[PDB]
C-alpha cells in the first residue's frame with residue numbers, strides 16, 4: 532500500500548460529519564492538515580471495527596489502486612491511516628456528491644454546455660485510466676463525484692448489468708472498450724438528469740434487448756450530436772466504438788458551442 536499511498540498522521544485529520552447516508556460506504560467529511568500546514572477538506576472512509584484480515588487487505592488494495600492515478604478528473608487519494616485505528620482512506624472532498632443523485636435534484640436546470648463540461652471531465656479521467664491499463668468495470672453516474680465547481684471525477688464505491696457491454700455480460704470480455712460502452716450509458720444518465728438506465732426492466736430483458744440491437748432512446752431535448760455519441764459508444768462490435776481520446780476530442784469540439792440540432796427502447 533505504501534508504494535502508492537502516503538501514511539497520514541491521525542493528528543492531522545479532523546472529522547466533521549457523516550456524509551452520503553451510506554451511499555459511499557462508511558464515509559465522513561473532515562479536514563486534513565498537509566505538511567506545508569495548508570488545511571484542505573477531505574472525505575474519510577473508515578474500515579469497520581472488527582474487520583477480518585481479508586477485509587483489511589481488500590481495503591488497503593483499494594487505496595493502492597487509487598494511489599496510482601494522479602489526474603484532475605480521477606478522485607485524488609490524499610493518503611491512508613494504517614498505523615492507528617480506525618484504518619482510513621482519505622480523499623479530496625467532493626461537495627456535490629454522486630453525479631446521479633446531484634442531477635436528480637436539478638432536473639432540466641443546467642445548460643447543455645454545463646452538462647457537456649461534466650461529460651468531458653469524466654471522459655478525460657477515463658482516457659487516463661485507460662492509458663494506464665486500468666479497466667474500471669463499473670463506470671456509472673453513481674460512481675462519478677462532482678465538486679463545488681461542477682468538476683466531475685471518476686470514483687468507485689463498489690457494488691452491474693445496466694452499465695455492462697454485451698460482450699462483458701456474455702463472456703466477461705472486459706476491456707477499455709467495454710468501459711467506453713459504460714461511458715455511453717453515463718452519457719445517457721447525464722443527459723437524462725439521473726434517470727436509471729433501462730428504468731426497472733428485468734435484468735434478463737436488459738440483456739436480451741441490448742443483444743437484439745435495442746438501445747436507450749434519446750433523452751428529452753438531447754442534441755443529435757450527443758445521442759449519436761451514445762450510439763457510437765454502444766456499437767455491438769467493440770472495435771467500432773471510439774477510444775476515450777476521441778470521445779474527449781468530440782466533446783471539446785461541442786464545448787466550442789457549434790448542438791442546436793435536437794434528435795420504449797429503440798431498435799438501433
Ligand SMILES: Cc1cn(-c2cc(C(=O)Nc3ccc(C)c(NC(=O)c4ccno4)c3)cc(C(F)(F)F)c2)cn1
Nearest residue numbers: 555558574575576593596606620622624625685686687
Ligand atoms: C475495490 C476497489 C475500488 N477501487 C477504486 C476506488 C475508488 C474510490 O473512489 N475510492 C474512494 C475511497 C475513499 C473515499 C473517501 C472516496 N471518496 C469518497 O467517498 C467521497 C465522497 C465525497 N467526496 O469523496 C473514494 C476509485 C477508483 C478509480 F476508479 F478511480 F480508480 C477505484 C479500486 N479497488
